[PDB]
Symmetry: D2
Subunit: 398 residues, 4 copies
């Protein structure tokens, strides 16, 4: 059948558009949008004050079949393609709730394990993940080291068949409701190469030495339990280490593409959200004898935004298609992420200007999405880094 293009639809969020989809995805959509209308938005204004969401919507989440959607079915996941697990990405954005740490779990942590883990490890965790009992997260950053992920200090020493973890990890998405945490740690301090001596681990909550810090007070993402994680001589087991020892950077390198494709879709989706939202506010808010939307200026400001969102959507869709065939390279990934997150902010700022005074009020969706979008250029690897990598191929014959 003929699916319309985003620019031609009645709404950017309209279900049933964009050729990278099929009628089967249409139906899975109603469900995810419906699930949020009933299980997420109704309580988010309560989880924000809390500093995290309930563990109750996490089990409901898994029970519904939205966690681990693109994780193979013969491992403990629904076993769908990417074209549909991203619909879970997109839909959370179309609801404006940055509390639930779904994707950071479904699309990233559930992906490392099912991709670089061992028989024992897969079965131990993948079922819990899809279930909703085990909450995943990852800790790469350190208060003193960041984009330079080559200069961290956390480490796990060689003790018997055990690894002794020592360190701290600031800024961890879902660092309070965590059960399983993929911590990046140095195993070779004298490692002749920053890349050659970093290992991955799966530290589990309930261990001696693993303390969780208070929920970090941020300017946005008020409902995300970001917190500092500590490691006080945690005696890890032989099942602790993930992938080969001193080969962490290798497993990380093969995941980023996906991570950035995710962050990206969300950004643009979140943009399609604010657009239709802002479009509505002006199509009614009356002034100077009729509506603001009757003003030429606003009409042109609107054309500019819809055009920029549409154009970028085409790129993100195109990137999803590639990734389906596993032919989406690290660079093309960095483009989608970089453009989409920079776009999300630009759109947010303008969209708030359009509400005027009520865009600063926490009551309207847009104000929350403003401080919610200023985290995109900062995490997942700053957009300054995205340029470095993109530029790698341009300037050097590598």
């Amino acid at each position: 059948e003929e699916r319309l293009e985003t620019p031609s639809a009645k709404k950017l969020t309209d279900i049933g558009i964009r050729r990278i989809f099929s009628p089967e995805h249409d139906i899975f959509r109603k469900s995810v949008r419906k699930f949020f209308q009933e299980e997420v938005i109704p309580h988010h204004s309560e989880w924000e004050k809390a500093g995290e969401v309930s563990r109750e919507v996490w089990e409901k989440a898994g029970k519904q079949g939205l966690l681990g959607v693109n994780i193979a079915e013969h491992l403990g996941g629904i076993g769908g393609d990417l074209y549909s697990a991203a619909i879970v990405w997109e839909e959370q954005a179309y609801s404006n709730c940055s509390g639930p740490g779904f994707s950071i779990h479904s699309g990233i942590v559930m992906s490392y394990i099912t991709n670089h883990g061992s028989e024992e490890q897969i079965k131990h965790f993948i079922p819990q993940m899809t279930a909703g009992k085990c909450i995943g997260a990852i800790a790469m950053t350190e208060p003193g080291a960041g984009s330079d992920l080559q200069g961290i200090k956390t480490n796990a020493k060689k003790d018997g068949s055990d690894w002794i973890l020592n360190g701290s990890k600031v800024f961890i998405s879902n660092g309070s409701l965590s059960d399983v945490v993929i911590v990046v740690a140095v195993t070779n301090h004298e490692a002749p190469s920053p890349a050659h001596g970093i290992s991955l681990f799966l530290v589990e909550n309930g261990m001696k030495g693993f303390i969780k810090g208070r929920k970090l007070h941020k300017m946005g993402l008020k409902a995300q339990d970001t917190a500092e994680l500590f490691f006080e001589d945690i005696r890890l087991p032989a099942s602790a280490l993930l992938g080969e020892e001193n080969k962490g950077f290798y497993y990380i390198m093969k995941e980023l593409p996906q991570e950035r494709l995710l962050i990206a879709d969300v950004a643009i989706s979140a943009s399609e959200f604010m657009f239709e939202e802002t479009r509505n506010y002006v199509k009614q808010r009356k002034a100077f004898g009729k509506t603001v939307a009757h003003l030429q200026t606003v009409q042109h400001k609107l054309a500019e935004l819809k055009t920029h969102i549409c154009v970028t959507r085409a790129f993100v869709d195109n990137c999803l298609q590639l990734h389906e065939a596993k032919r989406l390279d690290s660079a093309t990934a960095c483009m989608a992420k970089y453009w989409a997150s920079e776009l999300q902010n630009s759109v947010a700022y303008d969209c708030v200007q359009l509400h005027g005074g009520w865009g600063y009020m926490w009551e309207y969706p847009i104000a929350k999405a403003y401080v919610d979008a200023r985290v995109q250029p900062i995490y997942g690897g700053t957009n300054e880094i995205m340029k470095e990598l993109i530029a790698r191929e341009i300037v050097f014959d590598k």
Copy 2:
């Protein structure tokens, strides 16, 4: 002697720079800065939680002589010039403490009373205000009528020498600590336009009928008590009238320039703080054996912000000199409010970025400047309005 302009100064916020100031102005600014570092900066974290600052501080600022600076001294104010009052707006900006509403109080509310109010009204209010015992505020906006003042539904019917007040004003600053508020009320539903039937009233705290509503929840300005104000049949005595009846729109007119200059200067000043703050951060944050300030991309992103800040500041300081002389017209003040307020957010944004993760943390001074910055392009008249006005001398003849 000779002074340096922001560009050549060791730091944009140094004391003793910018040619529109004198040695005396410098001495004063040093005082005001000290005040903020010790009587405001230390309590802000609490006020943010509080959702409002203390009357304690407002009154300390009274003895100090920061309230009513450019208000004549033979009228209850401390009677300095415009540069001196400007200094207090700038200094509050340099402390990154949005909580205190000092500016609106002496820059706006107190001007309205000393410029159009009555002799008896002056005696009763000015000194109380210069001391900070009577915190003043102003309420023009209404839920659906902000950038269109003619569409204000708050009205005052006549009843003897009394006026009955009814209506609802949203977004009012200091609507939790306000003792005297200037309300914009329609007094003549019968007139060629609200611009001919509006009056200003001095609604005091405690008049039966004046319900100070709940503090609104915003994304920034966490320590400035922003609230809704309700008026139910308030019995306003003759004395409440400020200026001539149905002349409110004319007085508002006369004051708007200064209101725009004030935001102009706060905005540029706010940008000045962020810049020197971010500059410092990149010089300390370590990356690759060296500092992130060694990067060429960063170096350039800084030259851009600084250049755009130094440039805008020049214009704004040129507008301060023009207002001193009472020669800053409506358009020019609009240009200042516009360019500076717009510039403020673009500076906020590029600045959070250079902070990386932390810029997001409410721990860093910047994150608070970011949310405290998204307000400038909106209040005091959206930039869209400034453009329409600026454009009147351009397009029409």
Copy 3:
């Protein structure tokens, strides 16, 4: 089977990339790229000084079959899908020779006739237009009206089955070389709107009263013979009428999407060429020791550039596919022309800067590119008018 996207390709101009082309298209693109390299590129400077290309290059283009790559084989064209016609648009842009007014001929005029004209007309023109012996041009814009098309004044009055054409057009492409010009004229001086009283006419070089004005001096498109046209009491035989009398404007709205889409792709292809040409320069230009491609700022700029270009490229290849399926509406068509033409200029500005002073010398491809680009946001309907339209579906019904 598998094809890389511009991002992964070794160059955005590489033959054999982009999902919307069959291995058959590749082979074709190679002959066209060969055509411009060998038949256009070497003689362009000569045409630049002359202000118009040779008739030879046109005929050479008809023989190679580039004129009407998407006009029905049975009507007199060479047939082929839109993706093919596009290649000829794209390849020209890639040679950076805005001289040949090929696209307007093939993609527009040849299309107005095989879409609304009679068989006598179709038969009489289409064969020689593809052969490149008859150069066509479109002429609607006038001295006082372009955007607001219903504001024209060229009129056609009936005198028998004959037509008396009067008026003038300005900014007409392929103007001095045109043998055939589709003129837009008001036929019904009184109707609901000029939108319902407009007709089309095929004016032929030779008819008495058809005077070709002086060639125009422009900042760019130096080899594009842009001229002014004058119609002095022209008696057009009945066959001159193209389409149902007083329906023209409706015919025009139908073809606009094509025009916009065309511009869109020329625009982005130009940017593709430009980025590639600049990446080349920065890598072979040394300074302070290593090349200027090593400098971190030069990289990040290139990265931004490559991104915005690949992102736009996609949206355009999206509109090509859509137009192939006869499914490209006005708005979507508008988005492409607008976003792309502006991205075009922006890329040009940055690319010149990257060349340093050499980016100002006519000798380097980047300078013609800069001035040749400034026209896209203007013709084919101004970017403002593009928005006005894209905004209708957004705001109204």
Copy 4:
């Protein structure tokens, strides 16, 4: 007394505004304006075709006191304050005639000579130059070295009390009409950094081995005779050396501030010209029944342009004031050159878009302007070099 500022005047280009000028200055402005109105504008098209102005307009300029205005009266110049010199800069800009290379001549070359030249040099050149009978041109950029001024190859080696000059310089304004050219050349290859091994040389039209190359084809400055220069084993006497040996790079870094300040003023002045040409155009253009000036989008775009132009002018005049007092540093000057030249191209682009199809026809002032403006961000130090220097004092503490 009460001089209006650019925002308040009836026009940005009106005479008698801006607080940095005296009533005397206005009289002088009227004089200089009439001169372009009558002596330059009327003949510019023909110089455009020719690729150079006439020696006669230079001479008419010299006899009427427009050359060497800020040059010492007693040394040969007319002896006016910086502001008068600037007035000439500005008026040439207001006329939209970038043909006459007067600014480089009076503003750059003549300053170099009277600043670091001997008494014999001053007497031998200044009076001719103020008389427009001796045209000046500076030449330091080369086919392989521009931004990297420390990378030039042009050199001179001593031979008795003579110097042997060899090399080539590109992009030399006034290169065609020049009678004297200050040539930057290396005089000491063994210096630690070539910054200490450079010297200035007064090459004179006619010296053996001094060849004027091909007059360059550009996208703009069609009437500015920019050319390529050659020096093949020239025997320079001792007098030829301007200033002291190896102290060349020093004399230059000391003059740059004036080069950039001048470019900054020309830039913003060009922006004022374009504003008013366009304002007046949109106001007299009919479309859809009303003038285009009436379209709200057009008023805001115009309001933006004006505010940004008035704001930069404010910075620039403040910079002229500082320079007159000799207290304008390298960094400030750079901020000015940078911001203004960028704004110029920005304004030119918008202004062309408002003229519509006419802004592309050379017949219209705005077209000369758009192309003529693209060079400002490149010469006198590329805007990127401008940032390099501005950042220097932001990131480095004494």
